[PDB]
Amino acid sequence: GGQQMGRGSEFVKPNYALKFTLAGHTKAVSSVKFSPNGEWLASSSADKLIKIWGAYDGKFEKTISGHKLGISDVAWSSDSNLLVSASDDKTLKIWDVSSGKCLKTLKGHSNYVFCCNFNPQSNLIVSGSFDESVRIWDVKTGKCLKTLPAHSDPVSAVHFNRDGSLIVSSSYDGLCRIWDTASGQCLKTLIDDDNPPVSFVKFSPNGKYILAATLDNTLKLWDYSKGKCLKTYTGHKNEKYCIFANFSVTGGKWIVSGSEDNLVYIWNLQTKEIVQKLQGHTDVVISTACHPTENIIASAALENDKTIKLYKSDC
C-alpha cells in the first residue's frame, strides 16, 4: 500500500498508534474537531455537552454546557476562539472557548440541527437540519441570512470551500449539493448512477475536490469542477450512521474515516488501497478528525464505547 513521497520515501505507509484515550462523556460521542491552531480538541455528544481537551496530551480542559438536548456537531472559528454547536434542541450555540460562555443561540430551524461549520473568514455559519434545509447565519448578530430549501430529507453535512464562496451539502435523499454563498443558488447537484443516502461531505483542503460518504459502504473523491467521481474507497462499514471522514495531508496523502466495525480506516488517496485499520474502539466509530500540523488522528465512538481516542504517526 506504500505511497510515493520524496527521494528515499518511495514507499510511505502510515503507522498510527494509540497514545491517549479521552473519557468523560456519559453518552455517545458525536463530533470531534481540532482547533486550527492545533492546541485543542473539541468534542460534542448526546449527553448535551461539549468538552475541550489538549490536542497533544489529551488532558481534560473544560466542560461547555447549555444545550437543552443532545449535540450532533461542533466547529471552530478560524482563530480557535469561538465554537459553534448543533443540537436536538433545534438551535445552534456560539461559545467563547476561554470563558465557555454562550455568546449566541441561533434559533430558526424547525427540527434537529445535524451539522455546522464556520466559513474561513469566520463571519458566517452554515448548518443542516432534519428540517431538510441548509441555513446561513451571521456570526456577530445571530441573524439567519438565508434559508436554502436544500434537500428533501434530513441534511447530513455542510462545509465551506477554501475562499468561503461555496457551500457543499449532503443529505439522505442521495444528493450532494453545491451552493453559492453570495446568492443562495444551487450551482451543482452531484450523484452517481446509484442513489444511496449521503451520510457525509467535505471539500478537500484546496477546494478543488469533494469527499462524499454514502450508506452503501463507500467514500468517493469527486472533482467539483467536472462532476467527475475520480476515486472510490471501500472495505469499511457504512450503512447506517453519518460518519465523519477526512483528508490527511500532514504526512503522506490519506483518506481517514470511521467505520461501523469499530475500526478507523485509512487509505492511500491515489491507489485507493487500505493502508491501516486502527483498533481500540468497542462501538461504531462515528467521528474522526485530522490535526492541522502533526500526524495525529482523533477518533470518537458511539454509546457502548463513549470514548475519544488519539492516535499518532510518523507520516
GROMACS .gro file of C-alpha atoms in nm:
model
  315
    1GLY     CA    1   0.000   0.000   0.000
    2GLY     CA    2   0.311   0.227   0.007
    3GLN     CA    3   0.284   0.587  -0.124
    4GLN     CA    4   0.548   0.777  -0.319
    5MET     CA    5   0.665   1.087  -0.144
    6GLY     CA    6   1.014   1.246  -0.200
    7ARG     CA    7   1.360   1.094  -0.263
    8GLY     CA    8   1.414   0.793  -0.041
    9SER     CA    9   1.046   0.782   0.067
   10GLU     CA   10   0.925   0.584  -0.232
   11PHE     CA   11   0.725   0.352  -0.006
   12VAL     CA   12   0.549   0.551   0.269
   13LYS     CA   13   0.281   0.370   0.473
   14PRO     CA   14   0.131   0.546   0.780
   15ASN     CA   15   0.192   0.397   1.129
   16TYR     CA   16  -0.070   0.542   1.362
   17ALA     CA   17  -0.052   0.415   1.719
   18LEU     CA   18  -0.292   0.488   2.000
   19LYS     CA   19  -0.139   0.728   2.253
   20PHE     CA   20  -0.429   0.856   2.466
   21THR     CA   21  -0.789   0.765   2.545
   22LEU     CA   22  -1.013   1.053   2.648
   23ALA     CA   23  -1.301   0.970   2.887
   24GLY     CA   24  -1.589   1.162   3.039
   25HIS     CA   25  -1.889   1.187   2.807
   26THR     CA   26  -2.172   0.993   2.965
   27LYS     CA   27  -2.327   0.910   2.634
   28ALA     CA   28  -2.248   0.862   2.262
   29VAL     CA   29  -1.974   1.085   2.124
   30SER     CA   30  -2.087   1.272   1.811
   31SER     CA   31  -1.816   1.504   1.673
   32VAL     CA   32  -1.451   1.577   1.744
   33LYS     CA   33  -1.255   1.861   1.585
   34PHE     CA   34  -0.909   2.003   1.623
   35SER     CA   35  -0.884   2.378   1.665
   36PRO     CA   36  -0.697   2.542   1.369
   37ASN     CA   37  -0.405   2.630   1.599
   38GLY     CA   38  -0.374   2.261   1.684
   39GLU     CA   39  -0.367   2.335   2.059
   40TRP     CA   40  -0.711   2.195   2.132
   41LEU     CA   41  -0.960   1.923   2.055
   42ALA     CA   42  -1.336   1.991   2.090
   43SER     CA   43  -1.592   1.711   2.121
   44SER     CA   44  -1.970   1.708   2.126
   45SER     CA   45  -2.205   1.430   2.246
   46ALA     CA   46  -2.564   1.311   2.305
   47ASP     CA   47  -2.506   1.390   2.672
   48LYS     CA   48  -2.567   1.760   2.581
   49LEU     CA   49  -2.205   1.862   2.644
   50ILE     CA   50  -1.900   1.994   2.461
   51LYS     CA   51  -1.561   1.917   2.602
   52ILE     CA   52  -1.216   2.059   2.536
   53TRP     CA   53  -0.901   1.856   2.575
   54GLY     CA   54  -0.532   1.909   2.479
   55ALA     CA   55  -0.455   1.806   2.123
   56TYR     CA   56  -0.112   1.654   2.206
   57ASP     CA   57  -0.157   1.525   2.567
   58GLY     CA   58  -0.532   1.457   2.562
   59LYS     CA   59  -0.566   1.607   2.907
   60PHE     CA   60  -0.910   1.733   3.002
   61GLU     CA   61  -0.956   2.111   2.982
   62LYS     CA   62  -1.324   2.200   3.036
   63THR     CA   63  -1.698   2.142   3.001
   64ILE     CA   64  -1.913   2.381   2.797
   65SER     CA   65  -2.285   2.331   2.869
   66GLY     CA   66  -2.617   2.497   2.787
   67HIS     CA   67  -2.788   2.289   2.516
   68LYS     CA   68  -3.130   2.155   2.633
   69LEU     CA   69  -3.099   1.834   2.422
   70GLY     CA   70  -2.824   1.622   2.254
   71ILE     CA   71  -2.545   1.756   2.024
   72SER     CA   72  -2.462   1.619   1.673
   73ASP     CA   73  -2.181   1.850   1.562
   74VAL     CA   74  -1.924   2.111   1.663
   75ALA     CA   75  -1.695   2.353   1.475
   76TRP     CA   76  -1.416   2.601   1.546
   77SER     CA   77  -1.388   2.964   1.440
   78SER     CA   78  -1.081   3.023   1.217
   79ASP     CA   79  -0.893   3.184   1.510
   80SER     CA   80  -0.966   2.894   1.757
   81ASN     CA   81  -1.162   3.139   1.978
   82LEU     CA   82  -1.524   3.052   1.906
   83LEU     CA   83  -1.728   2.731   1.895
   84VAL     CA   84  -2.048   2.655   1.713
   85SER     CA   85  -2.251   2.353   1.823
   86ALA     CA   86  -2.560   2.188   1.660
   87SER     CA   87  -2.830   2.031   1.878
   88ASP     CA   88  -3.154   1.827   1.906
   89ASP     CA   89  -3.297   2.146   2.069
   90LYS     CA   90  -3.343   2.293   1.718
   91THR     CA   91  -3.077   2.560   1.782
   92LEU     CA   92  -2.704   2.614   1.741
   93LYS     CA   93  -2.490   2.784   2.003
   94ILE     CA   94  -2.191   3.012   1.968
   95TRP     CA   95  -1.940   2.982   2.250
   96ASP     CA   96  -1.638   3.176   2.368
   97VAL     CA   97  -1.383   2.898   2.436
   98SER     CA   98  -1.195   3.098   2.703
   99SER     CA   99  -1.491   3.159   2.932
  100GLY     CA  100  -1.703   2.870   2.799
  101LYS     CA  101  -1.988   3.124   2.774
  102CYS     CA  102  -2.274   3.103   2.532
  103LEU     CA  103  -2.242   3.405   2.306
  104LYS     CA  104  -2.544   3.339   2.077
  105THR     CA  105  -2.826   3.092   2.035
  106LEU     CA  106  -2.914   3.056   1.667
  107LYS     CA  107  -3.295   2.994   1.654
  108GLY     CA  108  -3.486   2.932   1.330
  109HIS     CA  109  -3.464   2.567   1.220
  110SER     CA  110  -3.788   2.377   1.286
  111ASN     CA  111  -3.613   2.047   1.362
  112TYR     CA  112  -3.287   1.893   1.490
  113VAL     CA  113  -2.975   2.070   1.365
  114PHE     CA  114  -2.741   1.797   1.247
  115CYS     CA  115  -2.426   1.975   1.120
  116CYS     CA  116  -2.228   2.301   1.128
  117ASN     CA  117  -1.911   2.489   1.011
  118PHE     CA  118  -1.777   2.849   1.010
  119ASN     CA  119  -1.660   2.991   0.673
  120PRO     CA  120  -1.282   3.053   0.662
  121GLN     CA  121  -1.341   3.427   0.735
  122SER     CA  122  -1.548   3.311   1.033
  123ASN     CA  123  -1.813   3.581   0.997
  124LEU     CA  124  -2.053   3.309   0.877
  125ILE     CA  125  -2.200   2.976   0.995
  126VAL     CA  126  -2.368   2.712   0.778
  127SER     CA  127  -2.598   2.441   0.925
  128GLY     CA  128  -2.800   2.137   0.807
  129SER     CA  129  -3.120   2.029   0.985
  130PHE     CA  130  -3.372   1.745   0.996
  131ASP     CA  131  -3.597   2.024   0.872
  132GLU     CA  132  -3.437   1.948   0.530
  133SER     CA  133  -3.292   2.298   0.490
  134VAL     CA  134  -2.945   2.447   0.486
  135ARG     CA  135  -2.919   2.787   0.673
  136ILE     CA  136  -2.653   3.066   0.659
  137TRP     CA  137  -2.606   3.272   0.978
  138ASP     CA  138  -2.431   3.597   1.074
  139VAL     CA  139  -2.181   3.505   1.348
  140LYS     CA  140  -2.186   3.850   1.505
  141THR     CA  141  -2.569   3.907   1.510
  142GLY     CA  142  -2.737   3.563   1.519
  143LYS     CA  143  -2.940   3.662   1.210
  144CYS     CA  144  -3.035   3.383   0.971
  145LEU     CA  145  -2.916   3.548   0.646
  146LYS     CA  146  -3.057   3.276   0.415
  147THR     CA  147  -3.263   2.961   0.435
  148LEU     CA  148  -3.194   2.729   0.141
  149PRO     CA  149  -3.462   2.463   0.052
  150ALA     CA  150  -3.166   2.234   0.007
  151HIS     CA  151  -3.291   1.875   0.008
  152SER     CA  152  -3.596   1.651   0.058
  153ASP     CA  153  -3.463   1.459   0.364
  154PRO     CA  154  -3.255   1.548   0.673
  155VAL     CA  155  -2.930   1.734   0.587
  156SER     CA  156  -2.626   1.522   0.679
  157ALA     CA  157  -2.334   1.765   0.629
  158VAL     CA  158  -2.235   2.117   0.530
  159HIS     CA  159  -1.894   2.278   0.481
  160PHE     CA  160  -1.736   2.589   0.321
  161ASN     CA  161  -1.469   2.576   0.049
  162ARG     CA  162  -1.128   2.744   0.053
  163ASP     CA  163  -1.245   3.109  -0.002
  164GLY     CA  164  -1.589   3.057   0.160
  165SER     CA  165  -1.759   3.137  -0.173
  166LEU     CA  166  -1.918   2.790  -0.194
  167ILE     CA  167  -2.101   2.551   0.043
  168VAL     CA  168  -2.117   2.172  -0.007
  169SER     CA  169  -2.419   1.986   0.137
  170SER     CA  170  -2.532   1.628   0.160
  171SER     CA  171  -2.850   1.455   0.270
  172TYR     CA  172  -3.035   1.127   0.297
  173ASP     CA  173  -3.206   1.198  -0.040
  174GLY     CA  174  -2.895   1.072  -0.226
  175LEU     CA  175  -2.773   1.415  -0.316
  176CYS     CA  176  -2.459   1.616  -0.268
  177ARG     CA  177  -2.529   1.983  -0.343
  178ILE     CA  178  -2.312   2.287  -0.407
  179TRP     CA  179  -2.448   2.631  -0.325
  180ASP     CA  180  -2.327   2.982  -0.396
  181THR     CA  181  -2.288   3.155  -0.054
  182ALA     CA  182  -2.348   3.503  -0.201
  183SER     CA  183  -2.665   3.414  -0.392
  184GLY     CA  184  -2.812   3.102  -0.223
  185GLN     CA  185  -2.819   2.937  -0.565
  186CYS     CA  186  -2.779   2.568  -0.639
  187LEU     CA  187  -2.473   2.553  -0.866
  188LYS     CA  188  -2.430   2.172  -0.876
  189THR     CA  189  -2.602   1.851  -0.784
  190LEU     CA  190  -2.351   1.561  -0.770
  191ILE     CA  191  -2.478   1.199  -0.786
  192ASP     CA  192  -2.352   0.874  -0.940
  193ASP     CA  193  -2.564   0.611  -1.108
  194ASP     CA  194  -2.688   0.462  -0.779
  195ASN     CA  195  -2.871   0.690  -0.533
  196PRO     CA  196  -2.775   0.582  -0.174
  197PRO     CA  197  -2.821   0.824   0.120
  198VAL     CA  198  -2.533   1.066   0.153
  199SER     CA  199  -2.400   1.039   0.512
  200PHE     CA  200  -2.111   1.297   0.480
  201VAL     CA  201  -1.943   1.558   0.261
  202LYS     CA  202  -1.642   1.791   0.275
  203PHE     CA  203  -1.429   1.997   0.044
  204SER     CA  204  -1.060   1.896   0.019
  205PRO     CA  205  -0.810   2.145   0.177
  206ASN     CA  206  -0.767   2.325  -0.160
  207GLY     CA  207  -1.138   2.337  -0.259
  208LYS     CA  208  -1.090   2.151  -0.589
  209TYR     CA  209  -1.215   1.817  -0.457
  210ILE     CA  210  -1.514   1.692  -0.261
  211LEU     CA  211  -1.523   1.380  -0.043
  212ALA     CA  212  -1.867   1.217  -0.008
  213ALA     CA  213  -1.963   0.917   0.207
  214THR     CA  214  -2.267   0.713   0.102
  215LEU     CA  215  -2.464   0.447   0.301
  216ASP     CA  216  -2.354   0.166   0.067
  217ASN     CA  217  -2.014   0.131   0.237
  218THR     CA  218  -1.838   0.380   0.010
  219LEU     CA  219  -1.640   0.703   0.004
  220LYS     CA  220  -1.583   0.886  -0.320
  221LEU     CA  221  -1.346   1.151  -0.437
  222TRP     CA  222  -1.521   1.388  -0.681
  223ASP     CA  223  -1.367   1.664  -0.889
  224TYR     CA  224  -1.612   1.951  -0.817
  225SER     CA  225  -1.525   2.144  -1.135
  226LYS     CA  226  -1.615   1.847  -1.353
  227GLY     CA  227  -1.890   1.644  -1.177
  228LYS     CA  228  -1.648   1.350  -1.212
  229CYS     CA  229  -1.605   1.093  -0.944
  230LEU     CA  230  -1.227   1.016  -0.956
  231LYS     CA  231  -1.154   0.761  -0.677
  232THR     CA  232  -1.360   0.520  -0.467
  233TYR     CA  233  -1.297   0.392  -0.113
  234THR     CA  234  -1.441   0.063   0.014
  235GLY     CA  235  -1.353  -0.215   0.255
  236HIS     CA  236  -1.512  -0.048   0.560
  237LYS     CA  237  -1.870  -0.050   0.702
  238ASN     CA  238  -2.107   0.242   0.650
  239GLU     CA  239  -2.479   0.159   0.600
  240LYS     CA  240  -2.646   0.340   0.888
  241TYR     CA  241  -2.452   0.614   1.062
  242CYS     CA  242  -2.333   0.954   0.941
  243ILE     CA  243  -1.964   0.904   0.996
  244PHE     CA  244  -1.716   1.193   0.967
  245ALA     CA  245  -1.439   1.148   0.710
  246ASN     CA  246  -1.111   1.324   0.632
  247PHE     CA  247  -0.822   1.413   0.404
  248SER     CA  248  -0.499   1.351   0.590
  249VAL     CA  249  -0.227   1.575   0.442
  250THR     CA  250   0.028   1.636   0.723
  251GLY     CA  251   0.215   1.318   0.618
  252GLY     CA  252   0.151   1.114   0.306
  253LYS     CA  253  -0.186   1.166   0.136
  254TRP     CA  254  -0.457   0.959   0.305
  255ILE     CA  255  -0.831   0.925   0.340
  256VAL     CA  256  -0.923   0.864   0.704
  257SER     CA  257  -1.269   0.751   0.807
  258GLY     CA  258  -1.455   0.593   1.095
  259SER     CA  259  -1.623   0.259   1.026
  260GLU     CA  260  -1.917   0.063   1.173
  261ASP     CA  261  -1.689  -0.237   1.252
  262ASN     CA  262  -1.534  -0.032   1.538
  263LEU     CA  263  -1.219   0.050   1.330
  264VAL     CA  264  -1.058   0.370   1.198
  265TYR     CA  265  -0.979   0.310   0.830
  266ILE     CA  266  -0.707   0.485   0.638
  267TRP     CA  267  -0.647   0.456   0.258
  268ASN     CA  268  -0.389   0.557   0.006
  269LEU     CA  269  -0.569   0.851  -0.170
  270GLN     CA  270  -0.401   0.777  -0.508
  271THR     CA  271  -0.418   0.397  -0.529
  272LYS     CA  272  -0.729   0.358  -0.301
  273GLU     CA  273  -0.552   0.071  -0.108
  274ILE     CA  274  -0.638   0.030   0.263
  275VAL     CA  275  -0.309   0.113   0.436
  276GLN     CA  276  -0.412   0.093   0.805
  277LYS     CA  277  -0.708  -0.023   1.021
  278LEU     CA  278  -0.700   0.123   1.373
  279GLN     CA  279  -0.816  -0.070   1.679
  280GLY     CA  280  -0.931   0.032   2.029
  281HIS     CA  281  -1.298   0.120   1.997
  282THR     CA  282  -1.567  -0.116   2.115
  283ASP     CA  283  -1.855   0.054   1.936
  284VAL     CA  284  -1.920   0.221   1.592
  285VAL     CA  285  -1.653   0.488   1.514
  286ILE     CA  286  -1.871   0.783   1.421
  287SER     CA  287  -1.632   1.074   1.407
  288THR     CA  288  -1.274   1.122   1.310
  289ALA     CA  289  -1.050   1.430   1.277
  290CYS     CA  290  -0.703   1.514   1.148
  291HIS     CA  291  -0.464   1.754   1.325
  292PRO     CA  292  -0.371   2.079   1.137
  293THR     CA  293   0.013   2.013   1.151
  294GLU     CA  294   0.101   1.687   1.330
  295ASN     CA  295   0.017   1.338   1.215
  296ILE     CA  296  -0.246   1.294   1.488
  297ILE     CA  297  -0.586   1.133   1.441
  298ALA     CA  298  -0.874   1.196   1.684
  299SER     CA  299  -1.141   0.925   1.687
  300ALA     CA  300  -1.469   0.907   1.884
  301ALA     CA  301  -1.710   0.618   1.930
  302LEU     CA  302  -2.081   0.557   1.997
  303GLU     CA  303  -2.295   0.484   2.309
  304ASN     CA  304  -2.149   0.139   2.402
  305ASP     CA  305  -1.798   0.297   2.393
  306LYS     CA  306  -1.836   0.667   2.493
  307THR     CA  307  -1.463   0.735   2.438
  308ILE     CA  308  -1.247   0.964   2.227
  309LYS     CA  309  -0.916   0.825   2.108
  310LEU     CA  310  -0.595   0.989   1.988
  311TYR     CA  311  -0.354   0.802   1.759
  312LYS     CA  312  -0.003   0.920   1.650
  313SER     CA  313   0.204   0.851   1.329
  314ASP     CA  314   0.548   0.925   1.170
  315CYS     CA  315   0.382   1.000   0.836
   0.00000   0.00000   0.00000
